[PDB]
Amino acid sequence: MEFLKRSFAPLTEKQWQEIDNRAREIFKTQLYGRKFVDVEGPYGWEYAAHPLGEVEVLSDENEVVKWGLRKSLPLIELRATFTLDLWELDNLERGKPNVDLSSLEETVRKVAEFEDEVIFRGCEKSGVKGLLSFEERKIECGSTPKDLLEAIVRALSIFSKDGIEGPYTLVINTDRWINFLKEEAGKYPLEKRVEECLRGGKIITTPRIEDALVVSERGGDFKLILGQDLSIGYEDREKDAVRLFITETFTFQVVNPEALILLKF
Amino acid sequence: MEFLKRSFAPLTEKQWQEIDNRAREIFKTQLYGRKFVDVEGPYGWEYAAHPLGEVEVLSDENEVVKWGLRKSLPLIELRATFTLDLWELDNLERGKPNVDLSSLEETVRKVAEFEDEVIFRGCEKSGVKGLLSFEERKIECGSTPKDLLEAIVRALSIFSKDGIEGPYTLVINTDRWINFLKEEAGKYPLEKRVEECLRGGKIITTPRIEDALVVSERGGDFKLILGQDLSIGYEDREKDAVRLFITETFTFQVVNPEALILLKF
Amino acid sequence: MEFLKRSFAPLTEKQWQEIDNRAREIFKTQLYGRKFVDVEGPYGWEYAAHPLGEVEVLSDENEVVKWGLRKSLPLIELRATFTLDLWELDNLERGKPNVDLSSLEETVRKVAEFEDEVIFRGCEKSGVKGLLSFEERKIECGSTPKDLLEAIVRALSIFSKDGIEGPYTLVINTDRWINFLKEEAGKYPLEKRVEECLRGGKIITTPRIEDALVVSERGGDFKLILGQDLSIGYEDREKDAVRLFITETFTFQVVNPEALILLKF
Numbered sequence: 001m002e003f004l005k006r007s008f009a010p011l012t013e014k015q016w017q018e019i020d021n022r023a024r025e026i027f028k029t030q031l032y033g034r035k036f037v038d039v040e041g042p043y044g045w046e047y048a049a050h051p052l053g054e055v056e057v058l059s060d061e062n063e064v065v066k067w068g069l070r071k072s073l074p075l076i077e078l079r080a081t082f083t084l085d086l087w088e089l090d091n092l093e094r095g096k097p098n099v100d101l102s103s104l105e106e107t108v109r110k111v112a113e114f115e116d117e118v119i120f121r122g123c124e125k126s127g128v129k130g131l132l133s134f135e136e137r138k139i140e141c142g143s144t145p146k147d148l149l150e151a152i153v154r155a156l157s158i159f160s161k162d163g164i165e166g167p168y169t170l171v172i173n174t175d176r177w178i179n180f181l182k183e184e185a186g187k188y189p190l191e192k193r194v195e196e197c198l199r200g201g202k203i204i205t206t207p208r209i210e211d212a213l214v215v216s217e218r219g220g221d222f223k224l225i226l227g228q229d230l231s232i233g234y235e236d237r238e239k240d241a242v243r244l245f246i247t248e249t250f251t252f253q254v255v256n257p258e259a260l261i262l263l264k265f
Numbered sequence: 266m267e268f269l270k271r272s273f274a275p276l277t278e279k280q281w282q283e284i285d286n287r288a289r290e291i292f293k294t295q296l297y298g299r300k301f302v303d304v305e306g307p308y309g310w311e312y313a314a315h316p317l318g319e320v321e322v323l324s325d326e327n328e329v330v331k332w333g334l335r336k337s338l339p340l341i342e343l344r345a346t347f348t349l350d351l352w353e354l355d356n357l358e359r360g361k362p363n364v365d366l367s368s369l370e371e372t373v374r375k376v377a378e379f380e381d382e383v384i385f386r387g388c389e390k391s392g393v394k395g396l397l398s399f400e401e402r403k404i405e406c407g408s409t410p411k412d413l414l415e416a417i418v419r420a421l422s423i424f425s426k427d428g429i430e431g432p433y434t435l436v437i438n439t440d441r442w443i444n445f446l447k448e449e450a451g452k453y454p455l456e457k458r459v460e461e462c463l464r465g466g467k468i469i470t471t472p473r474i475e476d477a478l479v480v481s482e483r484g485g486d487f488k489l490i491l492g493q494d495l496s497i498g499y500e501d502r503e504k505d506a507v508r509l510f511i512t513e514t515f516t517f518q519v520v521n522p523e524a525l526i527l528l529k530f
Numbered sequence: 531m532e533f534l535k536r537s538f539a540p541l542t543e544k545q546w547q548e549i550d551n552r553a554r555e556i557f558k559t560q561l562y563g564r565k566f567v568d569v570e571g572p573y574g575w576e577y578a579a580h581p582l583g584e585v586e587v588l589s590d591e592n593e594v595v596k597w598g599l600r601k602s603l604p605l606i607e608l609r610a611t612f613t614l615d616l617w618e619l620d621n622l623e624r625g626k627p628n629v630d631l632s633s634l635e636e637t638v639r640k641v642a643e644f645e646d647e648v649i650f651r652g653c654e655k656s657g658v659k660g661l662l663s664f665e666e667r668k669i670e671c672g673s674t675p676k677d678l679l680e681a682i683v684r685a686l687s688i689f690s691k692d693g694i695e696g697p698y699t700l701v702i703n704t705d706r707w708i709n710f711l712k713e714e715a716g717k718y719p720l721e722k723r724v725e726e727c728l729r730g731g732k733i734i735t736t737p738r739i740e741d742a743l744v745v746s747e748r749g750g751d752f753k754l755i756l757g758q759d760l761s762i763g764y765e766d767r768e769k770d771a772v773r774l775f776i777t778e779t780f781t782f783q784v785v786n787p788e789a790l791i792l793l794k795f
């Protein structure tokens with residue numbers, strides 16, 4: 001990847017490795033969307049659009065030759081920059097085990113948050129529709145631990161009436177889960193009951209939403225399309241610091257809206 | 266090519282061959298643009314857009330993460346229909362050499378004219394710019410046969426001052442050429458003089474323009490991009506007739522505007 | 531060639547190739563002197579002077595030991611600089627076919643003009659004498675197309691009286707050639723007559739002179755001596771631009787002044 005001009009920066013191999021290994025760890029645990037969707041393999045740094053499969057007509061009614069245009073989806077590209085310090089970085093060659101790298105982490109968190117916002121709520125100027133926008137898949141619930149177990153059993157019937165099968169998964173907030181655990185105290189464990197009602201499912205707690213939703217994981221309903229994965233590169237040299245950046249290119253879409261249910265409580 | 270539903274029409278092999286061979290001949294001689302441009306090979310019935318290689322910025326000035334969208338060109342698709350007669354078509358099996366096929370020819374001519382209009386004058390709603398739009402490549406001429414020979418020699422100097430080489434070609438109207446031939450009568454032939462001033466070039470007469478232009482043919486300056494070539498297919502059956510159609514998908518662009526000169530007289 | 535510090539510039543192989551290929555084309559057609567002289571092979575970046583073969587005496591008349599110094603010609607070295615833009619250059623990796631490179635071309639033209647001026651008119655401070663300085667090889671002509679054909683036939687006799695043979699070539703201005711072509715209109719072609727009078731020669735039109743001259747091309751009368759050919763290198767990096775330069779080292783001389791005739795009209 002020669003468009004990332006790495007070999008013109010005054011660093012060594014050990015310093016490059018130390019920089020990469022720290023960002024990999026945080027990206028592993030802070031990307032919540034990539035836990036239950038599909039990913040389509042990289043195409044390259046020159047890919048530009050993804051086809052939809054239709055045509056719109058722009059000619060009159062009485063003409064002999066008739067014509068129109070094809071339709072597609074554009075990709076999104078991002079870039080974010082930060083700085084580091086050379087004397088502090090150079091203590092690694094004298095044998096120091098712990099070095100200060102706070103700016104890197106602070107930037108990584110914001111990039112992850114930006115990426116999740118599009119999957120959960122969509123983008124207006126690009127023509128993307130998110131999960132929380134389908135308002136014909138909502139059902140009502142209550143505020144006691146009993147209504148949750150009622151609602152799961154009600155949802156599985158609607159799933160069966162449409163032909164959808166496979167393992168099922170629950171995605172829920174964190175404070176509500178803690179409140180439920182506090183309210184149910186001194187009795188049979190609640191995780192066991194929930195997994196038995198799901199018939200061998202899973203629970204995922206996140207701070208990105210405000211209520212709960214239920215999905216199926218047979219495969220082929222939510223797609224994320226990548227051109228280039230997340231990468232780090234070099235920009236310029238200041239008086240006694242260096243400047244680096246992070247980049248990526250992507251888009252997202254939803255195919256079958258019948259494998260998703262929203263709970264309101 | 267199974268999207269052209271040919272095998273559901275009540276015809277035989279000889280009738281299909283007779284229909285194809287007549288259209289090929291007229292398409293060979295009525296497509297004037299394809300004589301001096303480049304053609305990029307077919308990509309398929311699902312190709313949708315062609316990339317340009319840029320990005321436009323849509324974020325604010327003070328933000329930490331910045332983003333934009335990629336850019337491309339959409340393709341154009343066309344379709345035209347006509348009808349034929351079964352009893353008249355069926356005399357071919359009794360041994361008749363000449364059959365009436367006038368509607369086919371009348372439709373082929375209009376399709377060819379539509380295709381040439383875009384190359385010579387562009388399309389507003391698709392973002393295409395044509396040859397006659399570059400107004401900084403014009404020079405002046407006169408109305409006598411002497412000024413043409415002066416203008417060619419003047420143009421070759423401007424060609425040499427930019428680094429452009431290769432064989433050269435002249436494209437001119439028809440009535441003006443006939444008038445020049447009438448005005449020069451009883452002297453040395455004019456084609457020989459013109460080709461000697463071009464230093465071994467060629468002359469092309471067409472009814473599509475109104476003046477003359479000079480181009481170079483080294484290769485790599487005018488591109489035509491095809492998805493699917495021109496094809497014939499079947500639609501439905503009327504009381505005692507049949508209905509067929511013609512289709513294609515394409516786009517066009519100009520790379521180096523320095524291999525083109527326009528003459529005004 | 532390691533004195534051209536190329537590998538310290540933030541560019542890639544494709545960008546270097548794109549920069550070289552454009553300058554080669556313009557240098558090919560804008561160097562007019564190198565069409566009918568001889569070139570002596572490169573000697574290196576350390577060559578400094580070329581010997582003439584004489585000695586001048588600096589001692590008195592009555593002395594017992596007598597001495598002097600040898601004589602030679604010094605070489606000329608040049609350098610010219612320009613700047614380019616990084617974001618615009620970086621669109622080549624996204625797939626763009628046409629990039630802006632105007633400063634390079636504007637500098638190349640001036641370097642070519644500087645080089646031709648020395649061959650055609652000489653240098654005072656270096657001790658070089660040019661072609662248009664030999665005033666004992668001039669003959670007179672007129673302003674009609676007939677006098678040119680008379681003058682060529684007169685010149686070949688003077689050539690034969692000295693022992694000079696070989697193919698012959700005519701070098702002439704451009705506006706005068708166009709005026710001659712306009713004045714001779716409607717008759718036998720003029721290029722054929724001129725080449726027949728030259729007995730199988732060639733014609734070269736240039737904007738560098740004001741009249742015509744006739745030369746012979748048997749070999750060994752006009753020499754151009756090179757130390758290093760034309761080259762491109764890297765200087766420094768500005769805020770968001772880069773700085774590059776062009777260099778060369780040469781000299782020139784005339785051996786036999788009897789293979790050259792000047793026409794005045």
Ligand SMILES: Cc1cc2nc3c(=O)[nH]c(=O)nc-3n(C[C@H](O)[C@H](O)[C@H](O)CO)c2cc1C
Binds near residue numbers: 087090
């Ligand atoms: C013993 C010593 C070691 C130093 N080591 C480094 C170093 O590894 N990196 C660095 O950037 N500056 C270092 N400096 C400081 C450097 O000489 C200077 O302060 C700045 O590089 C420019 O003023 C060092 C200074 C001293 C006295």
Ligand SMILES: Cc1cc2nc3c(=O)[nH]c(=O)nc-3n(C[C@H](O)[C@H](O)[C@H](O)CO)c2cc1C
Binds near residue numbers: 351352355
């Ligand atoms: C001797 C004869 C031959 C015919 N051949 C054809 C034929 O080849 N194709 C056809 O469409 N109709 C043909 N017809 C006409 C057909 O029977 C009828 O007019 C229409 O097909 C429906 O009314 C023929 C009629 C006759 C009397």
Ligand SMILES: Cc1cc2nc3c(=O)[nH]c(=O)nc-3n(C[C@H](O)[C@H](O)[C@H](O)CO)c2cc1C
Binds near residue numbers: 077331
């Ligand atoms: C999406 C995006 C892509 C960019 N690409 C480049 C680039 O390829 N080269 C460049 O010099 N600057 C680029 N810049 C601008 C760069 O971040 C910044 O403007 C200057 O490099 C220093 O301010 C880009 C900016 C954005 C937002």
